[PDB]
Structures are given as C-alpha cells and as structure tokens.
Amino acid sequence: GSPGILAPLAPGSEDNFARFVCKNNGVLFENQLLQIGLKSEFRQNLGRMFIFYGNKTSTQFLNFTPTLICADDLQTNLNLQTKPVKPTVDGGAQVQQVVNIECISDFTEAPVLNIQFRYGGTFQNVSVKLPITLNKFFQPTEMASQDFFQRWKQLSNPQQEVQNIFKAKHPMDTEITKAKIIGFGSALLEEVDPNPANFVGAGIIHTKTTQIGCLLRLEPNLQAQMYRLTLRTSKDTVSQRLCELLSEQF
C-alpha cells in the first residue's frame, strides 16, 4: 500500500465509540500494536478533533495511511477536512492528525476511520467508528420551568416526539446520570418535572443553517431497573437520532 494503493477496508473492529458520545477525550481503540487516542472540542456547528496514533512496539510502522470513510449522504451533512500524516511511525512514537468538522445538517451515520500500515512485513488494516455524533453540535440552554413547559407543549405533534423504554445498562446512580446528560451537551434543568427522581434537559442543535431546539425527559424506574426517555425537538430526524444516542448511555 504505497501511496495511491489501498486494501479493501477491514470489517469494523470493536472500539469505544459509545463511550465517546458523552465524553470527548480518551482512547478510542487499542490493540497490541497501536493506540488510537482522541481529543476534541465543539462550538455550535463546528468542531476540531485530534487523533493520536501511538506505536506501542519497537518496530516502525510503514506506509501508515489513515483514511476517513464517509458515504456521500454523510458527506452532504457533515464536512470533514484533514491534513496528510507522515507514513512512517517510529517505534514508541506518537503522531497526530487534525480533523476540522462542520455540521451542515443533522446526520445519523458515523465516519469510519480506517488505518492501513506495514508492521515488519505484516499487513495491518483496522476500521473503527469515529465518535462524531449529532449531539456534538448540541449547545446547552438553561431555562425556567415556565419556558420549558411552553416549548414542550408546542412540540406536542407526534412527529416531534420520540420515546423509548429500555433496560438500564449501568447502575442507576443519580450523580452519574446527571453528568452523562451534561456530557451529552444538554443543560440539566432542576425542578421542572415535579417528580424529583426524573431528569429534564434542554439544548439547541446547531447546523450550518438552522438552530433546532431540543427538550428531553429521562424517567428512571429504580425497582424495575428501566428507563423511559422522551425527546421533543423541532425536527423529527433530530428527535430520532438524539433518542437513539441517549438511549445507549444509561
């Protein structure tokens, strides 16, 4: 795989994609040879992500070629720009790639990061899902209970609401749950739902053209170890994708 030659993309490897929905900095993937670290920041519809490739061996990686894979429909909604990476990674060395990100419109698919390189003549080919998700363009909005209910009532049309009941994956810990909601990009609104055990959030999704207001309600049932999540937003596909993402976090 000298420049201009690639192998077919490897099937997706197991990675830490879901751990990066509500967090931005950490290790996305690691095997015996390579560590892929991420650091990112986002503001309104823009972001900047740094990818760190760490060679855990004493042997050089040669022809080291990272490619971001995005279908045409995703490219229409999510603009990624990057710069070349040196194809030689020394043993024990770490190399950095910058990805500049613009959300054009809401989107569901995730970019795939494919990495091909030579390790002592072996062919290495790794494909991992990159955690650029719709909620990265979510700006928290604090608001009063009265403002929330006015907006919630407007979004009463069924197309605006997506609801999901699911079994808890993690301990039903109030403090961890609040931190997940904040890490998702939502404000955490206290004393809106008259049930003190429930969680309410609000924010705005920023695209190149449009601000999409979003409201959320998360209801635990501690005994049954279940949750009910309700999204009401000003765009049907945003309600769907945010509910899909947040439903996997508790």
């Binding site: 919630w152 049932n221 009910r228």
Partner: peptide
C-alpha cells in the same frame, strides 16, 4: 409496552 409504560412511568409532563 404501553402497559409497561403505564405501570413504570408517567404521568405526562404537566
């Protein structure tokens, strides 16, 4: 599911 939602959650937000 509607009944599970009945028994485990609700009522509607105000």
């Amino acid at each position: 599911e509607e009944q599970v939602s009945k028994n485990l959650f609700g009522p509607p937000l105000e």
